Design a protein around this motif. Structure first.
Motif, PDB file in Angstrom:
ATOM      1  N   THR A  29       0.811  -1.226   0.000  1.00 39.29           N
ATOM      2  CA  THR A  29       0.000   0.000   0.000  1.00 39.29           C
ATOM      3  C   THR A  29       0.840   1.269   0.000  1.00 39.29           C
ATOM      4  O   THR A  29       0.313   2.364  -0.238  1.00 39.29           O
ATOM      5  N   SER A  30       2.125   1.114   0.307  1.00 37.84           N
ATOM      6  CA  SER A  30       3.054   2.230   0.505  1.00 37.84           C
ATOM      7  C   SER A  30       2.716   3.129   1.727  1.00 37.84           C
ATOM      8  O   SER A  30       3.282   4.198   1.899  1.00 37.84           O
ATOM      9  N   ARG A  31       1.820   2.680   2.598  1.00 38.41           N
ATOM     10  CA  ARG A  31       1.500   3.479   3.785  1.00 38.41           C
ATOM     11  C   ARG A  31       2.546   3.378   4.888  1.00 38.41           C
ATOM     12  O   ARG A  31       3.123   2.320   5.108  1.00 38.41           O
ATOM     13  N   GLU A  32       2.761   4.497   5.578  1.00 33.64           N
ATOM     14  CA  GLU A  32       3.638   4.539   6.745  1.00 33.64           C
ATOM     15  C   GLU A  32       2.842   4.277   8.020  1.00 33.64           C
ATOM     16  O   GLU A  32       1.717   4.790   8.192  1.00 33.64           O
ATOM     17  N   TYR A  33       3.457   3.499   8.921  1.00 33.57           N
ATOM     18  CA  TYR A  33       2.922   3.248  10.261  1.00 33.57           C
ATOM     19  C   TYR A  33       4.045   3.314  11.277  1.00 33.57           C
ATOM     20  O   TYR A  33       5.222   3.083  10.957  1.00 33.57           O
ATOM     21  N   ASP A  71       6.682 -15.962  16.628  1.00 31.48           N
ATOM     22  CA  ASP A  71       7.099 -16.739  17.790  1.00 31.48           C
ATOM     23  C   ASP A  71       7.794 -15.865  18.831  1.00 31.48           C
ATOM     24  O   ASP A  71       7.732 -16.147  20.031  1.00 31.48           O
ATOM     25  N   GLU A  72       8.432 -14.793  18.375  1.00 28.85           N
ATOM     26  CA  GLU A  72       9.251 -13.982  19.262  1.00 28.85           C
ATOM     27  C   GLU A  72       8.601 -12.659  19.693  1.00 28.85           C
ATOM     28  O   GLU A  72       8.885 -12.164  20.783  1.00 28.85           O
ATOM     29  N   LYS A  73       7.731 -12.085  18.856  1.00 26.97           N
ATOM     30  CA  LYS A  73       7.264 -10.704  19.050  1.00 26.97           C
ATOM     31  C   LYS A  73       5.765 -10.494  18.888  1.00 26.97           C
ATOM     32  O   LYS A  73       5.084 -11.274  18.214  1.00 26.97           O
ATOM     33  N   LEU A  74       5.262  -9.433  19.519  1.00 30.15           N
ATOM     34  CA  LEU A  74       3.912  -8.935  19.291  1.00 30.15           C
ATOM     35  C   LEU A  74       4.045  -7.564  18.653  1.00 30.15           C
ATOM     36  O   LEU A  74       4.854  -6.741  19.115  1.00 30.15           O
ATOM     37  N   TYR A  75       3.249  -7.337  17.605  1.00 26.46           N
ATOM     38  CA  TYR A  75       3.293  -6.117  16.798  1.00 26.46           C
ATOM     39  C   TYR A  75       1.952  -5.395  16.803  1.00 26.46           C
ATOM     40  O   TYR A  75       0.906  -6.003  16.548  1.00 26.46           O
ATOM     41  N   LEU A  76       2.006  -4.096  17.069  1.00 25.91           N
ATOM     42  CA  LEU A  76       0.836  -3.219  17.015  1.00 25.91           C
ATOM     43  C   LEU A  76       1.091  -2.140  15.989  1.00 25.91           C
ATOM     44  O   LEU A  76       2.046  -1.394  16.101  1.00 25.91           O
ATOM     45  N   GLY A  77       0.236  -2.085  14.974  1.00 24.09           N
ATOM     46  CA  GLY A  77       0.349  -1.087  13.919  1.00 24.09           C
ATOM     47  C   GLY A  77      -0.438   0.156  14.237  1.00 24.09           C
ATOM     48  O   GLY A  77      -1.678   0.117  14.324  1.00 24.09           O
ATOM     49  N   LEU A  78       0.285   1.263  14.414  1.00 26.37           N
ATOM     50  CA  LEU A  78      -0.327   2.493  14.913  1.00 26.37           C
ATOM     51  C   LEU A  78      -0.140   3.613  13.891  1.00 26.37           C
ATOM     52  O   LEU A  78       0.768   3.564  13.072  1.00 26.37           O
ATOM     53  N   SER A  79      -0.980   4.640  13.962  1.00 24.62           N
ATOM     54  CA  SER A  79      -0.709   5.804  13.119  1.00 24.62           C
ATOM     55  C   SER A  79       0.600   6.461  13.542  1.00 24.62           C
ATOM     56  O   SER A  79       0.935   6.495  14.703  1.00 24.62           O
TER      57      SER A  79
END
Ligand SMILES: Nc1ncnc2c1ncn2[C@@H]1O[C@H](COP(=O)(O)OP(=O)(O)OP(=O)(O)O)[C@@H](O)[C@H]1O
Ligand code: NA
Length: 278
Positions: A29-33, A71-79
């Motif tokens: 999408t080319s979007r930044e987060y 397996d190693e990390k949790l990711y939260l996509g934020l503005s």
């Protein structure tokens, strides 16, 4: 569900006690987060952050777009809040003029009215947790220590001991619970800081701060916008039921009507061009 490989990571935007926030571009999408990453081996906080932010949908808050895990990390996509922390600007300019103090205080009030309308207490409101988007509107963050009050029980008090010493309310220190009005106490500390350049209760260690908070031991510098000082005096009140804006004081209407805000148009604040800080 998105995956790590769906993104190109760039620079680290910040680090927390056990989290790292990285700028990321989504390939498709080319979007930044701003992606907040937590190591698994190093959890109710992440869950709480997820649950609380999933409930929010207002322009003055960082938005949670997506989440995933490996397996190693949790990711939260934020503005991505491009302009960073409000605190940086306070330190840069030293203090805000009356127009800027008014505008930013109004945005925080608007945000808190929304948050409290949803029965959510922030509990860690402070300039470090008020970010700024590219357009210089606020984006409140850090909901891992926020609390959704139960509507089923008409819950008013939250029992978890969380916060930051300079902004923590006297009720949490003395009664061991916070309420929505605890965020209005933090608001008063923040308005004071915008005008004076430092928060009102200060010391080189936390116990000394707590002692001042509980005694309401603070002073105003000689030059402090008079209507702003009046507003601060109506927020920094030991009795949580007597702070302007609180439920027992009949809510946000009287707060928005304070003389300091006379020239504010509360509707579509997020569509107004913020005043330049210098
Ligand atoms: N959405 C965002 N856009 C831009 N920068 C951000 C964003 N979210 C966080 N940051 C930056 O990353 C830093 C760390 O964020 P994070 O919420 O992971 O930890 P924290 O809770 O701020 O740190 P601590 O746990 O030590 O209090 C923030 O202080 C902020 O400067
Ligand atoms: Na924090």
């Amino acid at each position: 569900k998105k995956r790590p490989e769906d993104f190109k990571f760039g620079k680290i935007l910040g680090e927390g006690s056990f989290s790292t926030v990285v700028l990321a571009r989504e390939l498709a999408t080319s979007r930044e987060y701003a992606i907040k990453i937590v190591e698994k081996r190093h959890i109710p906080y992440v869950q709480r952050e997820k649950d609380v932010m999933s409930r929010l949908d207002h322009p003055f808050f960082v938005k949670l777009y997506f989440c995933f895990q490996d397996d190693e990390k949790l990711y939260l996509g934020l503005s991505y809040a491009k302009n960073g922390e409000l605190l940086k600007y306070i330190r840069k300019i030293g203090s805000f003029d009356e127009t800027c103090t008014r505008f930013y205080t109004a945005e925080i009030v608007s945000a808190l009215e929304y948050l409290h309308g949803k029965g959510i207490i922030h509990r860690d409101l402070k300039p470090e947790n008020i970010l700024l988007n590219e357009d210089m509107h606020i984006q409140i963050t850090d909901f891992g220590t926020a609390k959704v009050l139960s509507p089923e029980s008409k819950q008013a008090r939250a029992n978890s001991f969380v916060g930051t010493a300079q902004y923590v309310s006297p009720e949490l220190l003395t009664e061991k619970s916070a309420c929505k009005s605890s965020d209005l106490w933090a608001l008063g500390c923040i308005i004071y800081q915008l005008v004076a350049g430092l928060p009102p209760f200060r010391a080189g260690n936390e116990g000394l701060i707590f002692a001042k908070i509980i005694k309401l031991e603070y002073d105003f510098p000689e030059k402090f916008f008079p209507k702003a000082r009046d507003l601060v005096e109506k927020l920094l009140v030991l009795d949580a039921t007597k702070r302007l804006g609180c439920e027992e004081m009949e809510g946000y209407g009287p707060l928005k009507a304070h003389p300091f805000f006379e020239s504010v148009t509360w509707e579509n604040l997020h569509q107004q061009t913020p005043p330049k800080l210098t």
